[PDB]
Design a protein around this ligand. Structure first.
Ligand SMILES: NC(=O)C1=CN([C@@H]2O[C@H](COP(=O)(O)OP(=O)(O)OC[C@H]3O[C@@H](n4cnc5c(N)ncnc54)[C@H](OP(=O)(O)O)[C@@H]3O)[C@@H](O)[C@H]2O)C=CC1
Ligand SMILES: NC(=O)C1=CN([C@@H]2O[C@H](COP(=O)(O)OP(=O)(O)OC[C@H]3O[C@@H](n4cnc5c(N)ncnc54)[C@H](OP(=O)(O)O)[C@@H]3O)[C@@H](O)[C@H]2O)C=CC1
Ligand SMILES: Cc1cc(Cc2ccccc2)n(O)c(=O)c1
Lengths: 358, 367
């Protein structure tokens, strides 16, 4: 077995929980020995501990640099009363991002036989009750100006208004996170309201021509946009990763939800077919990041190995039903066109056993 | 020949100009008689008249309530060079939009081989540290109100105001409620109401206030409903967002009487250079055709015109079912068979297609 080392992991809810556990027992643990800081973000436990788990889990990732996360129920009223929760807790993902900062990137994992671009997403509002001047003013600390622009003069009636700002530091991190990400995967980096959308283009350049292999960075406007590039701005084939400012701390995740609908059938004892891909990839993305930070060769090969098998397995035909519908189209899918959740998992572990054997 | 009545029409530019003329020659004029208020919004005539025609065309739609626009060139520094324009004129739609007001509505066109979507600035650079604020002095001498946007203590950055008048939202509301009745589809508004509690909280309210005092009766009188939702709970209906030869844009006014319709794409300059040069092309008319069929549809609703009303639907089918039957333009061919695998014998070119559409409208109509 391999020496994986420090890894913060968070168990989640419902159908993804069940899948998460399988991923571990059938793909991870049979191959890798990890220093595993486990946190249970399952809904009943978060409620029990007053979302405290979540806070510590977050401190843990800050502290160990690697985080993989299972999907977690976010509470609304139906849920507050379904689990008889003592509060409408906030989204765990909300909590974690706050504590960590940095920027999220989503990637569709591309299986050649189904019908890659990596996209990286990145105020005071009030009501005007009636006519009057609304003016957005700026006051240096050495008060040598007093730019104050008129936003609008209301005469019609009242209305609504707001003031959005953005700090340089925060723009820099974006570009940092962006450029770094763009190196790590060796893909062209692109980035897409005069002076605002503006100063962005600026700082990127200033940081490109100062800190950053046959690869380029550029600029565009939305519409102009083969594949295979980073870009600042099925579901079970989507993978979200939070890259922090420091470029050391990473937290990976499936970009879908807890798949309640599927889980509900599971509870009825009905066969399911849930796409483990997005979840598996979150693991590998973090495990390869574990590797990079440690210079662990064996593991670094393993994470890749696992990412490989998962495509090859779908490519050799064997796949889950959501994927079966992309090919066949929902209405005309035979059972014999896909595997259920457990059979799929069985097939991976099998192909993985074998791929790792050579 | 069905009499249609008062119709404002605006001829446009380049490729779309050509298609427009065919659309009238082969599919409209042979079946419908119209009191036509034409205006030529070609770049030439617009220039030669100091964009007066555009302004006239506007005031005329305001008047007769039904405008159908052919796509028109908006000039940029480059276009000006080419045409020797005496100014870089503002977009027609921009000027048209302002005179009539209202909200635009795009509609993708479904062939088995529907969702309508309606959408709706003071930036400046913070050099270094200091304070960014926004004020509201009320015009009635009451106490001036100050909000902190943010204190920049390290570097600078950037900041910006945004605003909106009540009146504008109300208009946004009406147009959408009118739009929902017109279509027989239920309506949804999407906001960032949790984040912009005070801002979007205003849209949501106004939609509700207007829904209940004005439209709740009529919606149920059609077995449909309006509802609010947040942007992620969102992802046969009308969707109000607070923010190709198969795409139809429609300006709807709040009075719900006036309406104006046009193809969403542009003037298709590429095909047109290819056309000037004399090579065959395969431009998609459908979107343009559809401007006519909403325009007519609307007039037919306004004027209690059962015979014209039927014509419109009749045509709308024909276009759909000509594609749905394997007869199509390259862009749609390519949609099915993949750009690299499209062959000549998979599509028909601009003229040939119009013919088929022509031939079929006859048949459909003879029944
Ligand atoms: N913490 C997190 O990571 C997130 C959690 N959530 C939470 O999840 C809960 C319920 O999830 P919900 O949004 O309803 O559904 P999901 O977001 O999990 O996905 C909805 C539908 O997409 C399809 N789908 C998604 N993922 C998969 C997969 N891995 N394999 C197969 N099919 C898939 C299924 O389609 P079909 O209906 O056809 O089966 C599913 O019902 C909510 O309480 C919400 O708070 C939501 C987003 C992110
Ligand atoms: N009046 C109006 O409402 C509008 C006017 N315009 C004006 O038009 C001018 C030029 O337009 P431009 O943006 O170059 O071109 P378009 O925006 O019309 O179209 C962009 C490209 O998409 C494809 N395409 C669009 N419509 C069709 C169709 N019906 N059938 C087949 N293919 C289509 C063509 O590319 P391909 O070669 O890939 O087939 C075309 O080159 C601009 O100066 C602009 O001001 C633009 C938008 C709206
Ligand atoms: C310049 C301009 C263009 C359009 C049409 C348009 C063209 C391309 C993308 C979107 C919309 N409209 O409507 C305007 O008001 C102004």
């Amino acid at each position: 077995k391999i020496s994986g080392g420090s890894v913060v992991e968070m168990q989640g809810d419902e159908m993804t929980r069940i899948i998460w556990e399988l991923i571990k027992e059938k793909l991870i643990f049979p191959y890798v020995e990890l220093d595993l800081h486990s946190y249970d973000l399952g809904i009943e436990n978060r409620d029990a501990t007053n979302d405290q788990v979540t806070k510590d889990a977050a401190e843990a990732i800050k502290k160990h640099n690697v985080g993989v996360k299972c999907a977690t129920i976010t509470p609304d009223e139906k849920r507050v009363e379904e689990f008889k929760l003592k509060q409408m807790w906030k989204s765990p993902n909300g909590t974690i991002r706050n504590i960590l900062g940095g920027t999220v990137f989503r990637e569709a994992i591309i299986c050649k036989n189904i019908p890659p671009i990596i996209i990286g997403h990145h105020a005071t509002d009030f009501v005007v009750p009636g006519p009057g001047k609304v003016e957005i003013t700026y006051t240096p600390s050495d008060g040598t100006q007093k730019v104050t622009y008129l936003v609008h003069n209301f005469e019609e009636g009242g209305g609504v208004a707001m003031g959005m700002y953005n700090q340089d530091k925060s723009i820099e991190d974006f570009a940092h996170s962006s450029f770094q990400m763009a190196l790590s995967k060796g893909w062209p980096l692109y980035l897409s309201l005069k002076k605002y959308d503006g100063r962005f283009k600026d700082i990127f350049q200033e940081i490109y021509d100062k800190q950053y292999q046959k690869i380029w960075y550029e600029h565009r406007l939305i519409d102009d946009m083969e594949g295979g590039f980073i870009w600042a701005c099925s579901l079970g084939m989507m993978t979200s990763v939070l890259v922090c400012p420091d470029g050391k701390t990473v937290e990976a995740e499936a970009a879908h939800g807890t798949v309640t609908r599927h889980y509900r059938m599971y509870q009825k004892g009905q066969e399911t077919s849930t796409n483990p891909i997005a979840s598996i990839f979150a693991w590998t993305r973090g495990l390869a990041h574990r590797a990079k930070l440690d210079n662990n060769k064996e593991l670094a090969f393993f994470a890749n190995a696992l990412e490989e098998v998962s495509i090859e397995t779908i490519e050799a035909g064997f796949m889950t039903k959501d994927l079966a519908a992309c090919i066949k189209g929902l209405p005309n899918v035979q059972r014999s066109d896909y595997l259920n959740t457990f059979e799929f998992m069985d097939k991976l572990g099998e192909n993985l056993k074998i791929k790792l054997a050579q």
